[PDB]
Structure formats: structure tokens, C-alpha cells
Amino acid sequence: QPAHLCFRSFVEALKVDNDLVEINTPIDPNLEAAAITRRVCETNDKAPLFNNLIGMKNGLFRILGAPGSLRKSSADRYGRLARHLALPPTASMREILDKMLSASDMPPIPPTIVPTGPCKENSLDDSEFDLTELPVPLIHKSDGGKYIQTYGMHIVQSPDGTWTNWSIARAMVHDKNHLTGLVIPPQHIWQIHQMWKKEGRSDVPWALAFGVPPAAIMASSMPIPDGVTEAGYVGAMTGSSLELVKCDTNDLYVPATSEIVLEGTLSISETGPEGPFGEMHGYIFPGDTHLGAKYKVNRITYRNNAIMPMSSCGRLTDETHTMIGSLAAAEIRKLCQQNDLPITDAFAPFESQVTWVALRVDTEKLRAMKTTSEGFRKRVGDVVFNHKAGYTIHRLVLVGDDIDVYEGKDVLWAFSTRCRPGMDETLFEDVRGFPLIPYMGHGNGPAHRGGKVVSDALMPTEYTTGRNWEAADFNQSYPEDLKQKVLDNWTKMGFSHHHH
Amino acid sequence: QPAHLCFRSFVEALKVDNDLVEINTPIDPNLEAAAITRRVCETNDKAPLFNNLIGMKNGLFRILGAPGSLRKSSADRYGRLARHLALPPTASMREILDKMLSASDMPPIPPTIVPTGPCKENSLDDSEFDLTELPVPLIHKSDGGKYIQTYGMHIVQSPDGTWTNWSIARAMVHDKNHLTGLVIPPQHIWQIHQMWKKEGRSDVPWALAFGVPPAAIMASSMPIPDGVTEAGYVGAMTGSSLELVKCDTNDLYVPATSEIVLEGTLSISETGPEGPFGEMHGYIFPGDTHLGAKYKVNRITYRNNAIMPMSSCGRLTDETHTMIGSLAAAEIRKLCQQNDLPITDAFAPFESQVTWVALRVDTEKLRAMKTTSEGFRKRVGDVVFNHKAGYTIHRLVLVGDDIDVYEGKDVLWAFSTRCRPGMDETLFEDVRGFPLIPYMGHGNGPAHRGGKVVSDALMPTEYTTGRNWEAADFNQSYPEDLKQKVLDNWTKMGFSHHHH
Ligand SMILES: Cc1cc2c3c(c1C)C(C)(C)CC=[N+]3c1c([nH]c(=O)[nH]c1=O)N2C[C@H](O)[C@H](O)[C@H](O)COP(=O)(O)O
Ligand SMILES: Cc1cc2c3c(c1C)C(C)(C)CC=[N+]3c1c([nH]c(=O)[nH]c1=O)N2C[C@H](O)[C@H](O)[C@H](O)COP(=O)(O)O
Ligand SMILES: [K+]
Ligand SMILES: [K+]
Ligand SMILES: [K+]
Ligand SMILES: [K+]
Ligand SMILES: [Mn+2]
Ligand SMILES: [Mn+2]
Structure with a gap:
């Protein structure tokens, strides 16, 4: 499967790109994995794949950090992002954002239902998993919980069935079979939650898919319009209908190649402690816990050798900057x-x-x-x-x-x-x-x-008659033929590559 | 003489530092010298010394560009500045600014008058020079004149003799024996000019010295207090009394080792066209000429093989940023x-x-x-x-x-x-x-x-009880012993010098 349509293939692509470091010795999910990832993000290094995570059992789970972070070189700075979208790794920001906007004036391509996929290779029922026994990371030393969810996609549908939203919102482990997370206005997960709360009959059917198609996680991070189903937008953007399989315990549909899938409900009544978390603006306020939304997990399904993507977010530069900021700007x-x-x-x-x-x-x-x-x-x-x-x-x-x-x-x-x-x-x-x-x-x-x-x-003259200055710079304050002479004689005179 | 006390020695110091490029083939003062200098400043390259300037005659003049601009390396970023002040080339900004402030709580060391110096090696009277025949640079393509004065020191004294100010203010050639320049409130050259205008009896005795002691040009760019004679502040800062010689045609005193000295008057009555100029904020507004102050030049004296320093100012980074901004901040x-x-x-x-x-x-x-x-x-x-x-x-x-x-x-x-x-x-x-x-x-x-x-x-808590966050960064969000483990295993795991 292509890298933009399958997370496992995306990981291969990063390796192939010389953009991955595989760490095969034991790494602790309590802070170590996130500290390494943090350092990567602050230095624009290669993405870390932790293949030997302390506490990994029965295939849950390896971690990929920094999935959407920057590369060191200027020429392929945004190459990880480009690899979410089938673009050349030297794509500019303008090209990336245009790709993300391209579906806005296209017909949706709705998803295709298939009977199975890799995300069904393994399952754990309600008597077989315990979220406190998985190698969920502590991402920052003062976090109020182990944030399992930093780069998966929440899937919720309006009560009438007409809108299925895919979005990233954080969540942490509450207990063996619950998460708490942010569900806040004006976000679509919140807007849908409010529809279920007004109907008042049941909790919201929910799934959280980790390691989804990269093109889908990009749309999950973008504020496309109210009422627009992200799967059909991604289908239009990529030119292809996404393959989805039904959840086992509800009637939502998840990408077939998802690495890990949680199925359950988002409560219309209960809350639990959430946060604090080290957040996109660069801070954590220790002790600042507040009631958040509460999710119940009834089932886990997962790929053999499942990989959990993780954002170790904070100070520059990580997914919260490259994706939240840029996609909102778009x-x-x-x-x-x-x-x-x-x-x-x-x-x-x-x-x-x-x-x-x-x-x-x-x-x-x-x-x-x-x-x-x-x-x-x-x-x-x-x-x-x-x-x-x-x-x-x-x-x-x-x-x-x-x-x-x-x-x-x-x-x-x-x-x-x-x-x-x-x-x-x-x-x-x-x-x-x-x-x-x-x-x-x-x-x-x-x-x-x-x-x-x-x-x-x-x-002021930009509103009236036009720009009335020239920059006091090399480009604008000297004629072309002088500029080119200077450049041509630069190293000859004694002064000091694009790719690098 | 030490580099901080003699411009000629400063040039040697830059050479010795591998911070100079000597250009010995002909270079045009019409834009070329400044274009090369501009490129240097935008790329933090070595300072250019133009030894073969087209139009140089009888020793007037060579040009040194980018005298106070940045070096490429982080470890000696401010080294040109440090070389104005006898500091190690790895001095921090804090150390530079502290050096510049140190004289504020010291007794002045007044200057010492000596009978001659290198600035008297050559002279041109009122029948022998023509400022339009010297190789004065056109610094930006739209400038309103040839800006001879971008890095010399104007010397003016209060009518009562009690305050002699040294400062940088721009000036351009008006005609064979005049300059026009900026003389604006609240600057000390303006404050002194106003004192002479109120007295109403004569034009202001004036000198402009180019290639002065580097420690003096730094003070010339700093807003030390009203009424404080910069020569005595520089003497206190450096620990040594500066050696000055009397002008020939007036009773002002100039640094003995000045490269080039103009003697004359700053009019209390006349003005002439001045500007536009490519300025420190990065712009020029072509055509934006206004009346400026007018200087009459009666005499030129100069060193053998005189060197004119030049600031090709504009967009980042040059003397107008490194000196105006930092010294005001100090x-x-x-x-x-x-x-x-x-x-x-x-x-x-x-x-x-x-x-x-x-x-x-x-x-x-x-x-x-x-x-x-x-x-x-x-x-x-x-x-x-x-x-x-x-x-x-x-x-x-x-x-x-x-x-x-x-x-x-x-x-x-x-x-x-x-x-x-x-x-x-x-x-x-x-x-x-x-x-x-x-x-x-x-x-x-x-x-x-x-x-x-x-x-x-x-x-808010910084006003009350104290900082109530930790940064979401590698430094603050992980314990010391983990941080150090990460660092120690960084290259081992696969990831990527101070001087570079
Ligand atoms: C890329 C990204 C996006 C996060 C995000 C993160 C990342 C890595 C985290 C998980 C590491 C940190 C927190 N995040 C949250 C978040 N939006 C939100 O409502 N709650 C969040 O907790 N977002 C932004 C959210 O995905 C965008 O606002 C989408 O537009 C939401 O989709 P929607 O338009 O369908 O509502
Ligand atoms: C370093 C530097 C300082 C310039 C300067 C330049 C440089 C290179 C130029 C020449 C390239 C561009 C224009 N400059 C002017 C200027 N101040 C001013 O009144 N008019 C100016 O034209 N300054 C700032 C001035 O030197 C400081 O404000 C001093 O504090 C003035 O000294 P004073 O406190 O004794 O008045
Ligand atoms: K979305
Ligand atoms: K404006
Ligand atoms: K000054
Ligand atoms: K504030
Ligand atoms: Mn949405
Ligand atoms: Mn002054």
C-alpha cells in the first residue's frame, strides 16, 4: 500500500528516506521515549522508532515519535509532511497546503467498506485488556496521566448518521477501561457530543484509531467545514476511496490498515480528571487538573507488531506547530x-x-x-x-x-x-x-x-497608489548586472549547497 | 597601538583573526563596494577591505566595510565588537554591554593633548580638495547622495566649552566643500546645535573624524547622558587617557590616529537637500529628500594610505542593529x-x-x-x-x-x-x-x-507567589539523570562542534 494510505508503509518510507532511527534496545515509556522524541523535535533530527518498549506485551506496542516534525535540511524541511500526502519530499509549504485544500472544491469520494484488514489481526475483549498495563507513555514529567492519545483519530458520528468526523484531540488513561480527554468548543468532536447529549438517550458510539493512513491524520488535524465527513474529503484529496472496516462492537468504520483501534463510547454524562499536559504553546502548569470527557473502551483490535505514533509536544517544533498551525492557516x-x-x-x-x-x-x-x-x-x-x-x-x-x-x-x-x-x-x-x-x-x-x-x-500607499519603497537589501538596492557580478566573483574575491 | 585604541591596528586585528578579506583589484565606489558589503552583512561573512578603490587619489581613500557586523560562528558571533573594546573575541553580549556601561560609575579620564599624530601625515587645504572628486560611495541605488559619513564621529562642543560630544550621524556630499546630514532631536549633536543657534553669533565649530579608535566609535553610537563628554567616558572604560591632537583650523581636538579628519563648521542658518538613504529598518523611500543640516569643510587631514570605514546599512545585520540597538538597550x-x-x-x-x-x-x-x-x-x-x-x-x-x-x-x-x-x-x-x-x-x-x-x-503569578509552570521542553520536562542518559546515548542510538 502507498505511504500516504497506510501507516506501516509510511514508516517504511521514512526508513527509505534516511529519516528514521530504529532503537531496538529497551526504552522506557515512562519519560524516556518522549525525552528522546522531544530532543529530536528541538533539533529537527530523524524520527525515532522504539521497537523495544519496556512493558510491550502480546504485540502492544512499539512507538514512532515525531511523525510530522521537521527535517534538518532546508531542501526537504517538510518532507515528513510531504510523505503523508504522496508529495515529493522537497514540496514547499504552499504545495502541502494547496494539497490539503484541493478537496474543498471537489465532490467527496466516499469510503469503501471491506470485510477485513490488518487492524483485525489481533483482538482483546473486555476481560483481556487493561489500559494501565500497556506501555502508555508519560510524555512530560508533570503530566497528569499517561497520554495514550496524541496522534490517533477519534471517530464519532452525528445521531442522524449524516456526518462522521475524524479529528485529533488528546486523551490519557483513567483506569483499566477508560480514558479522559479534551472535548471543547468549537471542535467537531464537541459539536457532535452536544448533539448526543441533547438527544439524551445514549452515550456516543466511538472509536479511536492509531496509526491511520497518513493522509487521514492530516485531515484529522485540519478544521475542514462543519458537517463535512473527513473520509470523503481525504478520498477526494488522494483521488481514491479509503478502505474502511466495521468495528466489532459498534457500527462505526475504521481504516483497514489502522495499527491499533479502541472501540467504545464517549459518555454524555460522566467526566473524570484530565491533565495537566505539556501543550503546544510550550508549557505545563503542574497540578492544573480539570474534569474532562470520559471514554469507555470495550474492545481493542490491532495489527501484528502494532506501532503507536506519539507527539512529544511542547516547544518548537512538533506536530502541534507543523500541523495545527499550518492547516488552520490553510x-x-x-x-x-x-x-x-x-x-x-x-x-x-x-x-x-x-x-x-x-x-x-x-x-x-x-x-x-x-x-x-x-x-x-x-x-x-x-x-x-x-x-x-x-x-x-x-x-x-x-x-x-x-x-x-x-x-x-x-x-x-x-x-x-x-x-x-x-x-x-x-x-x-x-x-x-x-x-x-x-x-x-x-x-x-x-x-x-x-x-x-x-x-x-x-x-499606507498599498491601499492607494502602490508600494513606494525599495528594500535596503542586496536584492533590491543594487541593479541586476551588479548583483550577478558580485555573485560570480564571490568566492574568487575570498568570501564563502542547496541540498545539504 | 592596541586595536581598541587605533583603527589601523583594529584592521590588523581583523586580518589576524581571519575576519578580513582584502580586495586588491579595482572596486567601484558607485554601488559595488556597498553591494559586496551588503552581502557580507546579510551572510555574516568576513569584513571587506577595498584597497583599490576606483577614484582613490593621493591617498584618499581605501574602504573597510562591515566594521561592527556579525561573524558566522556562534562562538565568536560578536567578535568584531569585542575587538572594538579589548575583549576576548568570544565575549558575550552581556560582557560587551557591561563593558560599555562600566564607565558610568567611574570618574572620567580626560584626554591627553599631544602635538601630532598619524592623522597629520597629509593635508589638503581649501584650494586643494573637492569632495565630489573623492571616491565617496553610493551605498544604495536610490540614495539621494554619496554618503561619505556612515561610520565617522562628529565632534561638536557646547558654546561654554564644558561638553564635547562625539556621535555618529549620517552625512552625504552636497558640493565640493559641503555635506548635508541629519541633525535631529533629541540627539546630542542637535542639542549642541540648538545652543549655538540660540547664541546666534557663529556657525558651530566642527570636525568629523573617520577611522577613530574603535572604543571611541562604540561610545559615539551609545546614548550616554546629556552633558557627558564621550572622550572621558571612553578613557574611563579603557583605563587610559585618549591621545588627541588639535585641529589645524579650529580649536577642537581629534583622535591622534584618526584615518581621515574633516574640519569646518556646522551652519546655524543654512540647510540643503539630504536623503533619502537606505536606513536601519531596511527601507529606502526613493525621492523622499528633505532639508538637512549643512556642514562646510575647510580642511582635510589624513593618514598615509587612509582607510574610510563604511556601514552598508539596511536589512539584518549591520552596525545599525548591532550597535544602535544593543547600546540603547544597555x-x-x-x-x-x-x-x-x-x-x-x-x-x-x-x-x-x-x-x-x-x-x-x-x-x-x-x-x-x-x-x-x-x-x-x-x-x-x-x-x-x-x-x-x-x-x-x-x-x-x-x-x-x-x-x-x-x-x-x-x-x-x-x-x-x-x-x-x-x-x-x-x-x-x-x-x-x-x-x-x-x-x-x-x-x-x-x-x-x-x-x-x-x-x-x-x-500573573510572577507578581504574587512565583512562576507556576514548567516549560514543555527537553530541559525542563525531564529529570536530570534522564536527560544526561539521553545525551550520553545520542550518537550511539543513531542521532546527530561549539567552535565551528
Ligand atoms: C496535530 C494535533 C492536533 C491537536 C492536538 C494534538 C496534535 C498532535 C495533540 C494531541 C498532541 C495535542 C492536543 N491536540 C488537540 C487538538 N484539538 C483539540 O480539540 N484537543 C486537543 O487535545 N488538536 C487540534 C485539532 O486536531 C484540530 O483543531 C482539528 O481541526 C480538529 O478537527 P475538527 O475540525 O474535525 O474538529
Ligand atoms: C552606529 C550608527 C549610529 C547611527 C547611525 C548610523 C550608524 C552606523 C548610520 C550613519 C549608518 C545611519 C544613521 N545613523 C544616525 C544615528 N543617529 C542619528 O542622529 N542620525 C543618524 O544618521 N545613529 C545613532 C546615534 O549614533 C546614536 O543614537 C548615538 O546615541 C548618538 O550620540 P549622542 O547620544 O551623543 O547624541
Ligand atoms: K478534522
Ligand atoms: K500599517
Ligand atoms: K554618543
Ligand atoms: K502578561
Ligand atoms: Mn471535522
Ligand atoms: Mn553624547
């Missing part, structure tokens, strides 16, 4: 275009801890709008900050066409030199806020509301 | 401490285009103040933004003790995650603004007023 780009805003590109700079999105403006189109910064800032912020795709983002930075939003140094240059604090900004207090940012949930104001801003780094 | 650190604010460190992040200063707070001291963010932000902003040392700085970022302000990634992390936009900020509109920032002089509001902000990246 959706925001589309949302602005569909609202008739002249946005060409969007990216969440890593330097902002993916709390900003830079929006590149087609300033020829802006000029024709015959508008002002105040009016344009307000329009952009109202579109983005009132929508779920803007949930995680607290600062939007508007930049003109000279800026590559995929280059954080250029975004920071433009922000710092073109946006006058206060005057060139509009604050938004009456919008949903992202509580996980420390300045929100642990800050001075409401954890769930406000704290957002549009920062206009467009210069 | 003075701001001291100013806050003298105002009883618990600031331990200050630095202007390069990523902010040196428009921000990050202030590291001793949070134990802050706790004992029993204050709040609103009150503390206001106090800090009032101290800094009402003072000349804060002139160039538009955003102050307050951070706690865990942040290394000399590390821009950490400042950006803290800003982005700990400062809630709006709520955690105080805007300052009734303070002097720095017009050279594009969003000021080419922006939506008053060019000279406002646009400043204090952004509080202290978390």
Missing part, C-alpha cells in the same frame, strides 16, 4: 477568499508559537477596493475570528505582496517595521478565545473570550 | 535600575529590527513591590519612553527570569505566549516617536509622536 486562506478578501497566502509563523497567522494581500485587488486600514482590518478580523478556523489564532498580520509569509524572518520584519502599535491594530474582545494559550487560560482576563488582534502591516 | 537597562526598577538585562532583538527592547525582570524583587501589571507597565514606559535612551525603541517587552533576552527565539516565545494583546499592554501616544521607522514617518499617524507600547510578558 483553511483561513480559503475562508478569506470565499469572503471576497484579497488574500493570496496564509501561514502561522513558528516564531509566534503558531498563535499568529500572516495573511499575504494582493494589493492590486486591495487598491481597487478603495478602502482604509481601519475598515479592512475590521472586515478581516470579523471573518476570521468569528469562524472556527480562526479559533487557535490570536493575531492576524496583514502584509503586502513583497512578503513571503512562509518565511518567519520576513513576517517579523514586516510586522516590526510596518505596523504602528495601537493605531494600525484592531482589538477583538467579543470573540471566542483559545484557552490553552497561557495568557488566556492562565492570564489576566477571561480564558474563553477576547485577546485577539488584527495587526495591519500594509503601508 | 543604557535603558541602567536607566531602569537607577529608577529603582528590578531590571537585570536588556537587549534589542534583531528580529524586531531593533525596534523592541526586551527587559528581564528580577521577579523576586518584583514580588516584593506588591504591584500589578497595569501599574508596573506604566512605570517602566514612563521612565524609558520619556528619556532619550528610549528614543529609537517603540516596544518594550517585560519578561521574567527564565528568559534570556539575548536570545531572540526565547523573547519571541515569551511575547507570543505570555502577553495578551491589548489587555497586557499599555500604549503611549504622548511620547517622542522615532520617525525613521516606516510606520512612523511614512505611516498613518504623527511622524514624531506616539506609536509606543509596553507589552507585559510576565505571567
